[PDB]
Each structure stands twice: as C-alpha cells, then as structure tokens.
Design a protein around this ligand. Structure first.
Ligand code: K
Ligand code: K
Ligand code: K
Ligand code: K
Ligand code: K
Ligand code: K
Ligand code: MG
Ligand code: MG
Ligand code: MG
Ligand code: MG
Ligand code: MG
Ligand code: MG
Ligand code: MG
Ligand code: MG
Ligand code: MG
Ligand code: MG
Ligand code: MG
Ligand code: MG
Ligand code: MG
Ligand code: MG
Ligand code: MG
Ligand code: MG
Ligand code: MG
Ligand code: MG
Ligand code: MG
Ligand code: MG
Ligand code: MG
Ligand code: MG
Ligand code: MG
Ligand code: MG
Ligand code: MG
Lengths: 110, 97, 288, 85, 245, 95, 87
RNA sequence: GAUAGAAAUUUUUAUCCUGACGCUAUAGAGAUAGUACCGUAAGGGAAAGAUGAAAGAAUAAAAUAAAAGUAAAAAAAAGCAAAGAUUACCCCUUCUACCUUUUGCAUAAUGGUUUAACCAGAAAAAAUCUAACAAAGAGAACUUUAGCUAGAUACCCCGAAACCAG
C-alpha cells in the first residue's frame, strides 16, 4: 500500500486528515489502519443490537474508556454501556456513534 | 468385566525421536518462502485427499471421479452402493427440514 | 506499551502443556446419552418426526403449496443475459486520489482502478465494466482523464468542470477478462486479440456525443461539452492550453485493448521482450 | 490397492506387447484410427453454433450419433453401413 | 540497527548478541529488534489456534470399518418372520448380530484440512517470538560458528549458560550451514538445527530455548512486517507483482 | 430440495421459486397476486386493481424461500435500467 | 537432529513423455506448450511461431467472426430500418 | 411437479521424504477355511489359539481364586421382600415391581430366567458465540451500503408381505 502523498492543504477534499507529527502526550494510543483511516466501525447483531467498535488500541485502555464515557455523557445524559477487552485491545460501545467518535479521535490526533 | 491381573510393560515413549522433534517444521514454507509452495503441497496420503476436506458423501463422490477407473471390480460396486445410500439418506431423511 | 509483557517474566514458560482456547469460542457438543438427552434423543414420539421421513421442503400436506399457487411472472426472465455495471462514486474516486491509490498524472482506465483496489470486476457474472455515478459531484476537485463503460450527465459535468476528459468504451467479456487481469493473461502464452464491437443494442449509446462515446464523431464533442457547461452554469476550461494536454488526449483504437500495445503481439514476460507478427494475413486479420 | 494403469487402457496396452508388437506398422496405424462413420440414420446439423428460438441467444450445438445394432447376418452381405435401430 | 521504519509512537527493543566460539564469549554486542515483531501483544490464544492447526491440518485417518453392506454374506432372511417364535431378523450381518457390521463407525480415510487466514498465521509467529524474548528464552548468536564438531561441546555450553534442556538452532539457508555446527547437532536429540524457512510455532514451543542468527533476524523482520501494509492478493504471489518478486 | 447433489456435492435450487418470485437485497420477496388473469369480466373494478398489484411476503414465506434457493440468487446485482434497483436497500427502519 | 532440505519448486521447464501411456491428457495439449513459453520462453525450447493461428486456423477464425459478428455499418443501417419502421 | 443439469472459457512443477490420534481372538477379512457341516443342484457357511529361558525341568511349574450357577450352611405365622429402626435376624410401623404404550396401567395390557461380550444421532445454506483484518476481506476464479475469512455449535437402529433380472 503506497503512503499517502503530501498535500499542501489539509484536510483533503475527501475528508482524510493525516496524523499529527508528534505522538500525543496521552497514555493510550490508537494505531491507524493499513488504509490510513481511523479504526472505528459499526457492528450489528440479532438484527437489533447496534454497537460501535474501536480497534487497535495500545496502552492503558481504561483511560480510553473513561475519556469516552464523559465525552458521550452530555450527548445522551447517561454513561454509555461499554465493554473493555484488554486481551485484544478493543473498546465496544453500545449504539451507533461511529461518526462522532471519528471526529473526536481526529481532533486528538490519532 | 474381569480385568487383567498383571501390570503391563510400561511403554517407554521418547518425546525426542526424529519424528516428534522435526514434527511440523516446514508448515510456514509459503509465508517465509516468497509464496512458492502452499502448505497443502506437503500432505502425504490418498491422491484424492491431498488438500481437500468434506463430509462422507462428497468424499465418496470425489474418490469415484479421480481413482474410479483404477479400482477393483468388487470395490467399484461397494462404492456405488455407498453413494446411493448416502444420497437417499442425506436428502430424503433427517429431522431438520 | 504492552504492559502484559512485564507479567510474563514472573509467570512460567509458555509451552504446549498450558494452552487454553478463548472462552466461548468452542461451544461443547451434546450427545444423546443420559437421562436428559435419552430415550428420545430429541426427536419426538412416533410419526414422521421420530422416524425421520417427513416430506420435502415446501410441502404443506396435500394442500397446494404456497410456491405453486402463485402465477408465473417474469422477474428473472433473461437475467443471465442482462448487462451489469459496477458503480463508482466520485466520493470514492476522490478518496482514491487523496491516498495515492491512483494518480491523475497518468491516464486512468479500468485496469488502473483494479490495481488500485477501487473496484472489483467479475467478468463471469455478466459485468460489462464500471459506470460513473454522481454521488460526490459537489466535492470533486480532481482533474483526471478517466475512461469508463457508462457515465451519467452529472458525473460528466462534474469532471469537465475541473477540466477533465470522460470517455465511454465497450468491452466484450472475452476482452474484459483480459483487461481486468492482464498479468494472468500474459502467462497464458496467447496473442492479444482484437476488441469486439458493441452489439446492436448498445450502438446508439456509444455513437452519440452526449454520452462521450468512444466511437462518436469527435467534431460534435466541443458543442456537446459547451451544452453541459451552459446547463450547469460553469465556465468551460480551455483544455488545449494545459501542460498535460498530451496525456489528456490519449485514447485507444476501437480494436485495441491496452495503451500502446497492438493485437497480435505476444508478451514474453520472462525475457522482457515483445513479439510481433510478420505475415500479411496475420497483420491484416489483427488490424481489421 | 488400485491398478497402476486404468482398466480402460488394458486393451490398448495389449497391442503393444507380444505378437501384436511385431505386426506391420501400416496395419496398426489404420486400426487405431477410430473415425466417426458417415451418418446414416440420424440427420446431422451443419452449423456448429445455433440460435435458440426461445432464448434468442447464440448457443453451441453438437451432433451425437445414434447407436445402431449390427446383427451377424449383416456381415455376410452389403447393407450400406446400416442395421437394426 | 533496525532497517525497516520503526513506528514513531514506539521504540525498538534491544537484546544482547552472543557468540558460540567460546563459553564466556557472551554479550559481545547489542542489536535492536523491531517492536512490531518482537514486542507485539502477548496473544496466548492466537498461539492455541496455530499450534492446533499445525497438528490437525495434515492428519488423514486410515480407519475404515465395514458396514452391513460391505460384509461378506448375509444376503438371505435367516428364518420366516411369523410362526418361528423368535425375534424377526432380515440378515445375519445386521449390527445386532454377532458377526455384523458397524452401524456408526469410522468410514474411509478422513481428512482434516482447514487453512487459517494468512494474517492469523503471521500473527502466530510474531507472538511466539515476543513470548520467547519476554521470558529470556531468546538468545541471538552472531554467525553461528563452533570451535569443534564434538557434540559434547554444545552440551556443556548450554549447561554453563543455563540454556534449558532443549535448544533450537536456526540458520538462514540450508547449504550455508557450517560443517562444525551440522556435525555437532546431528548426534543430539534435544539440540536441533533448522533453516530459517522451517521456523514455526510448534517448534518454538517444543524446545525450551530459541537461538536466532543475526542474518536470520533481519530475514524474519523483513518477511513478517510485509503483511502489515500489503494488499489482498488479486492473484497468487508466486505470479509476478510490481514490487514483490 | 436436494441438499447434496450427486455430481458436485453442492446444494441445488428449486426452479419453481425463481420463475415466479423476485428477491430484493433487503431480504423481502416480491410476488404477484393469485388469480390476476382469471375471469376479469366477473370481478369489480376495485378487485381487479387489487389483483394487479405486487405484494410482499411475510417472514415465514420469506424464510421458506431462502432455504429453497442457493446463494447465487441472494447476491447484489447492478442491472442497467432496472426498475427495482432503487428498492434493493432498506432505509429508515427503526427496529 | 538436522532438518530435511526445504521443498523448493524448480524453475526449470518440464516436458512429459508423449509416448508414456500414463501421462495426463492435459499435459500434452497445445495449450500446455504455450503456457511453458509464457513461463520461461527462452528455456522452453518451443518455436514462437506456434503461438499464432495457422493458415487453416486463420481461415476458420476469419469466417466465424465475419458470419456471427456483423460490421459497424451493418449495425448502424439495421437500427435505422427499425427506427423508420416503428416511427 | 419431484427433481435432472452442461459447455464456451479457466487452474494444476518434477524424484525421495510412507506410513497409522486402524483393530488385537463376540474386534479385524468369512478364514486355523470357503475347510467341516446343512442342501439333489445353484447356493448358504461356522465355532475354534494362551505355562516357561528349557516340558531332552508332568513326585512339573506359576498365576486371579473376583460374572451368573452350586457347595461350605434346607426351612419356623405376616405378605412387591425394603425402609424407619432396635440391646435383638424376624415379630412392630410405613410403602399398588420396572420400562414401553395411554385420557387413565399394581393391573389380569406389552417385553425381560440370570451373567459376560457386542448393539442405536451423521451433514454447517441462514444464524448465535470467539477471533483476524476492516470499506474492504479471502494463499486467484467470489462476496461487499460493516462487511468478509477461519474455527466451534446438526438431523438413529431392527423388521415386512412384495417387485425385477439372471
Ligand atoms: K436432511
Ligand atoms: K429426554
Ligand atoms: K465371523
Ligand atoms: K394381551
Ligand atoms: K401395544
Ligand atoms: K418393552
Ligand atoms: Mg458483524
Ligand atoms: Mg442438540
Ligand atoms: Mg453430534
Ligand atoms: Mg430407558
Ligand atoms: Mg416409542
Ligand atoms: Mg401420533
Ligand atoms: Mg386432494
Ligand atoms: Mg461484483
Ligand atoms: Mg448384501
Ligand atoms: Mg431377497
Ligand atoms: Mg429386509
Ligand atoms: Mg467384522
Ligand atoms: Mg474371528
Ligand atoms: Mg473382543
Ligand atoms: Mg462365580
Ligand atoms: Mg413384616
Ligand atoms: Mg394406581
Ligand atoms: Mg385405552
Ligand atoms: Mg401423548
Ligand atoms: Mg404384566
Ligand atoms: Mg398391545
Ligand atoms: Mg414374557
Ligand atoms: Mg453458515
Ligand atoms: Mg412397479
Ligand atoms: Mg422374476
């Protein structure tokens, strides 16, 4: 897979925004995909269960969970139900919040 | 239900013979060999079962296709009866349907 | 990073004696033994249930089945002969360019899209190419010379706004299989064959200048291009004054498959050499 | 246990050994050539490709000869290449 | 020093370089190991899948018992159904009878062939190397030469350095293995020499100590890190590719 | 339904279903009303209109027809000038 | 112990014996010879002239494509007749 | 209707590395053997072996003394044969054998003298669980508007009168 070419202006017309040059001074870290996109995906089970999955997380995952909980708290009025999978490094959030999370992680530079 | 009254000679199995020490050495030939030989090209056994898997019906059908013309008369008949019975049982019998 | 590696120093060595599958990955199998799963084995009591001779699927017991009392109508009549076109959106076309999957410096055709993993074409499933859709016409800021098999009015207008070139060409399934997978074809040791003409049904689509057909009369393109510019209210760029005019004007002969190659050529990939015929009949047949 | 050579080739390999091997080559060459005989009963179709009247599509067609039984009485005369159907 | 680009947010892991030319010729240098291979996540359940896969991907059973159809005889009804006074039977080869077949037995040669996806197998090698390094079971040997062909030399060398009971020696290529090492390890059971292409999960877990040669370490990192940023195979990689010969 | 064929060992399909049903990619099946060509002079204007309308099939019928046809007919198809092309995907379904 | 030599796929061309009765049928077809040329070519030892259709084959190819695939002029005029007829 | 089902066109690198998550005398071939034996004939077709280094160590030696069945040792009011117990086996008190089949069986409805050996749930389209990678997945050929690939979870045994060919 070729590396993304350097652009004079960001974000690109397709919305793609390259990661910040320095690593953010945060405990957890979220690797980019092999296609250079934020690894936030939807997942549906039983036809009525809607979940959002954050993959490829290194470091203190519990820091990521707490930052997600108070980020989505004002939007919902309650702490969202989350699952932490340390053996894999995946945070699972009940509901369709993929678009909101991708913008949130992009601002933090992951 | 009578059991044997004498202790059998204990089998002294050596875990480090030639077979066990070199077991599964070249399983990653494709990954670490520029993808020149798939790991299915190391299987030793029947001609029709090298790198293939299936249930009992698909196995008997596959055997008849490849080595059918090389089988004996009696074996060729027994295979045909096995195919017919499995064909009738799998399609015309069972619980979930 | 992986703080679990610190825990591994204290723990004993990992060997074949202590390995456990992921919990929940292997549901245990239930066998018909014991009081619970016994004396009936989950079949029933008499009838065609316990003896396993219930009727076929869709049989309602003598009554006319649901799938036999509905009158026949043609929903899949001739579906195996209808042409299919994989849609490509300008949102995805912009996405590919920004990430370097494809480059606008070099002309883009169906082959370059496949190598860029943009679209996947299955010639066997009656796919005749890629159609351009106008899903992302508003945010399309690229300048490309793209060649597809079907285009829409808004998709053409969006590309021509930035100063691109759009052309529609027809590919026979025999040729389309070669075009989408060129390397496997070159390993078959066969001469490159001529591209076949579109059938009588598809002649008007590729002959009119409104669709930017490859077989269309070039004299009517400039007046057709200006109609789109007038219709959508965008100033038509003068493409002849750009430094990439040589690249943007590149086309293919109707009997030609690849760029710069000719029918009858044999590509010997092992020796990195190209073979060409010499007989008059061979040259005439591959060029007629 | 399986035969190394398929059963269908046993008769062909019978000709490659023994007295059959010393037979003149010209006789053997004519014997091994199994050319399809001239159609007598069935009526063949000239075109290799045909258009389906129902489907209106180009399809491939092949002539399949109709088996014919030749009684031993025929070998004593000249029936013109035909027999019981 | 690592050649392939190390990710910015992490740093390479380092390990001592040893030599086999002497008992005390240890710690003769320092080598950097790529974090994405030798410092990856400790997946102890992706090793279970690969370890089981290497055991049940070539197993072809050879058990075939004869069902009631394939038994020699029993083609006739033994006695008339009504009036005899005994239980009704239809053949003397049914599974009830003494000499009958098997109603449900192993039928023919059964093949257990299933292929895990390639990225799981590659992930299996990465975690095994990380586990070996994290538990001090990985030693790097420079160029893998031995003073003598006597097999007793390796036994005492491993005893002095506490290399455990079994040691797995690797080399980059088969024809390039030196004669001293080949002759020394050809007479030992717990010590085995395998080319770099013959490395896998089961061999690592079988031997309590893994020894990697410096040329092989660069070979492994080049092959295992290629899958992180690759495309799905349009056609098999044995066929020519633009940048993968 | 032939679960396992005798030539290739795959799963066959029932040609009766495809000749009189249309499967949308959302899982819904489409069919014609029964009796839309029989005795039209007898039926009223409203009744004839009702019989000429396409209708959907409930869950049991939809589930039944999915086990009678193979996986070739469940694929995503992009036909040219397909009237039902816009009905393939479901939208605004709050279940 | 010492491991067995790794299994390697040789890059040399292969040619089965045509006179062997046990050879596979697909290994004597003309398609196999062309595939060897595309694989090796220089080491295949097959004349490059065999890759193009012969004069007998070329006449067959010329007739089949002419009778079944019409010309652009024929297609254009055929549609004009139908358009005039329907109008 | 049940079901039957191609082709055009594609793919396939050689020799060694071969042995066993196959059985161990009701298993595995029927086999110690198509022999005894039953049939005029075609045909059907078995059960059966065990000491030790030496039996040219048979006043010979070692091993479990553990299936049903008997002996050592016949029985003493009263009862689905046992339990609650009791200083005490009974005596006392309390309990309508077991499976199958039925609206309902101690039923006088079915089957079993008892013992050992042998004898009956099998398939992965859709789905749920776990994981890899993710707008893409898969070691070609396909599926894709969070999907694709891999694993795990599944559907028995005995029996007719008959029918056809030699
Ligand atoms: K079934
Ligand atoms: K039960
Ligand atoms: K027997
Ligand atoms: K009775
Ligand atoms: K009864
Ligand atoms: K009973
Ligand atoms: Mg999902
Ligand atoms: Mg169950
Ligand atoms: Mg089961
Ligand atoms: Mg019971
Ligand atoms: Mg019952
Ligand atoms: Mg009933
Ligand atoms: Mg009726
Ligand atoms: Mg497709
Ligand atoms: Mg029989
Ligand atoms: Mg009979
Ligand atoms: Mg019977
Ligand atoms: Mg037996
Ligand atoms: Mg026996
Ligand atoms: Mg036994
Ligand atoms: Mg006893
Ligand atoms: Mg009493
Ligand atoms: Mg009662
Ligand atoms: Mg009653
Ligand atoms: Mg009942
Ligand atoms: Mg009774
Ligand atoms: Mg009764
Ligand atoms: Mg009785
Ligand atoms: Mg499934
Ligand atoms: Mg009849
Ligand atoms: Mg008869």
């Amino acid at each position: 897979i070729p590396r993304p070419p350097k652009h004079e202006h960001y974000p690109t017309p397709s919305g793609w925004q390259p990661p910040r040059d320095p690593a953010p001074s945060l405990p957890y870290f979220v690797r980019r995909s092999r296609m250079h996109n934020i690894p936030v995906y939807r997942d549906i089970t039983h036809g009525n269960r809607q979940m959002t999955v954050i993959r490829k997380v290194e470091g203190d995952i519990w820091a990521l969970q707490k930052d997600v909980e108070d980020f989505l708290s004002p939007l919902l009025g309650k702490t969202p139900v989350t699952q932490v999978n340390e053996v894999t490094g995946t945070l699972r959030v009940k509901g369709y919040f993929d678009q909101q999370l991708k913008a949130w992680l992009l601002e933090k530079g992951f | 239900f009578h059991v044997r009254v004498t202790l059998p000679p204990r089998k002294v199995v050596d875990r480090w013979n030639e077979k066990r020490a070199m077991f599964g050495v070249y399983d990653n030939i494709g990954i670490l060999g520029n993808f020149e030989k798939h790991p299915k090209e190391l299987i030793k056994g029947p001609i029709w079962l090298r790198g293939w898997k299936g249930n009992e019906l698909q196995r008997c059908i596959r055997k008849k296709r490849m080595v059918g013309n090389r089988m004996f008369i009696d074996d060729l008949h027994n295979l045909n009866k096995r195919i017919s019975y499995l064909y009738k049982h799998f399609n015309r019998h069972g619980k979930y349907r | 990073g992986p703080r679990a590696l610190d825990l591994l120093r204290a723990l004993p060595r990992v060997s074949l004696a202590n390995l456990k599958p992921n919990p929940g990955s292997r549901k245990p199998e239930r066998r018909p033994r014991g009081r619970r799963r016994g004396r009936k084995c989950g079949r029933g009591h008499k009838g065609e249930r316990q003896r396993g001779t219930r009727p076929r699927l869709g049989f309602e017991g003598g009554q006319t089945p649901f799938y036999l009392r509905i009158p026949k109508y043609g929903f899949n009549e001739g579906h195996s002969f209808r042409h299919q076109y994989q849609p490509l959106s300008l949102n995805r076309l912009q996405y590919l360019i920004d990430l370097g999957r494809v480059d606008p410096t070099q002309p883009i055709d169906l082959t370059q899209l496949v190598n860029g993993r943009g679209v996947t074409i299955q010639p066997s499933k009656r796919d005749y190419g890629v159609q351009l859709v106008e899903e992302g016409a508003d945010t399309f800021k690229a300048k490309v010379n793209i060649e597809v098999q079907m285009a829409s009015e808004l998709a053409i207008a969006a590309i021509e706004k930035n100063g691109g070139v759009v052309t529609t060409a027809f590919y026979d399934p025999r040729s389309l299989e070669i075009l989408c997978k060129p390397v496997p074809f070159f390993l078959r040791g066969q001469p490159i064959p001529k591209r076949m003409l579109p059938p009588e049904a598809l002649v008007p689509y590729y002959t009119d200048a409104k669709n930017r057909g490859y077989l269309a009369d070039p004299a009517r393109f400039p007046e057709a291009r200006l109609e789109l510019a007038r219709k959508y209210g965008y100033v038509l760029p003068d493409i002849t004054k750009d430094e990439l005019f040589k690249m943007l004007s590149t086309r293919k002969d109707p009997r030609q498959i690849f760029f710069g190659l000719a029918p009858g050529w044999v590509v010997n990939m092992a020796d990195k050499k190209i073979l060409k015929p010499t007989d008059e009949n061979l040259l005439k047949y591959y060029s007629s | 246990p399986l035969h190394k050579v398929p059963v269908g080739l046993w008769k062909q390999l019978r000709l490659w050994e023994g007295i059959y091997s010393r037979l003149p080559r010209h006789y053997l060459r004519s014997l091994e050539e199994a050319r399809t005989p001239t159609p007598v009963h069935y009526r063949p179709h000239g075109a290799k490709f045909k258009i389906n009247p129902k489907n209106w599509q180009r399809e491939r067609v092949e002539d399949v000869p109709i088996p014919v039984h030749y009684p031993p009485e025929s070998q004593l005369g000249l029936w013109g290449g035909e027999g019981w159907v | 020093k690592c050649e392939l680009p190390v990710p910015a947010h992490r740093r390479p892991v380092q390990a001592w370089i040893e030599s086999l030319r002497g008992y005390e010729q240890e710690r003769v240098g320092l080598t950097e190991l790529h974090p994405d291979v030798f410092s990856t996540a400790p997946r102890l359940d992706i090793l279970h899948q690969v370890a089981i896969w290497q055991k049940n991907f070539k197993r072809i059973s050879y058990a075939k018992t004869k069902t009631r159809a394939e038994v020699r005889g029993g083609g006739r009804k033994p006695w008339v159904q009504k009036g005899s006074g005994r239980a009704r039977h239809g053949s003397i080869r049914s599974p009830i009878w003494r000499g009958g077949g098997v109603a449900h037995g192993p039928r023919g040669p059964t093949s257990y062939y299933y292929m895990l996806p390639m990225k799981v197998r590659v992930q299996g090698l990465k975690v095994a190397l990380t586990v070996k390094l994290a538990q001090d079971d990985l030693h790097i040997v420079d160029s893998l030469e031995l003073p003598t062909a006597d097999p007793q030399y390796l036994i005492e060398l491993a005893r002095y350095r506490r290399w455990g009971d079994s040691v797995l020696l690797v080399d980059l290529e088969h024809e390039d293995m030196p004669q001293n090492v080949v002759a020394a390890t050809s007479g030992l059971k717990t010590f085995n020499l395998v080319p770099a292409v013959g490395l896998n999960v089961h061999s690592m877990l079988k031997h309590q100590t893994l020894v990697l040669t410096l040329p092989t370490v660069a070979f492994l990192e080049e092959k295992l890190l290629w899958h992180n940023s690759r495309y799905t195979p349009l056609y098999p990689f044995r066929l020519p590719y633009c940048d993968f010969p | 339904v032939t679960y396992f064929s005798s030539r290739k060992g795959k799963r066959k399909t029932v040609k009766a279903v495809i000749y009189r049903f249309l499967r949308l990619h959302s899982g819904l099946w489409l069919r014609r009303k029964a009796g839309y060509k029989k005795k039209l002079w007898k039926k009223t204007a409203a009744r004839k209109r009702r019989l000429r309308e396409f209708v959907f099939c409930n869950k049991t019928q939809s589930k039944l027809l999915d086990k009678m046809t193979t996986s070739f007919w469940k694929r995503r198809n992009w036909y040219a000038d397909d009237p039902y092309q816009k009905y393939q995907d479901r939208t605004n379904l709050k279940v | 112990y010492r491991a067995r030599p790794p299994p390697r796929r040789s890059q040399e061309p292969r040619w089965p014996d045509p006179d062997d009765p046990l050879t596979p049928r697909w290994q004597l077809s003309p398609r196999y010879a062309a595939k060897q040329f595309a694989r090796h070519g220089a080491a295949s030892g097959v004349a490059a002239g065999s890759l193009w259709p012969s004069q007998e084959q070329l006449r067959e190819l010329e007739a089949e494509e002419r009778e079944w695939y019409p010309s652009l002029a024929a297609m254009q005029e055929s549609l004009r007749v139908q358009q005039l007829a329907e109008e």
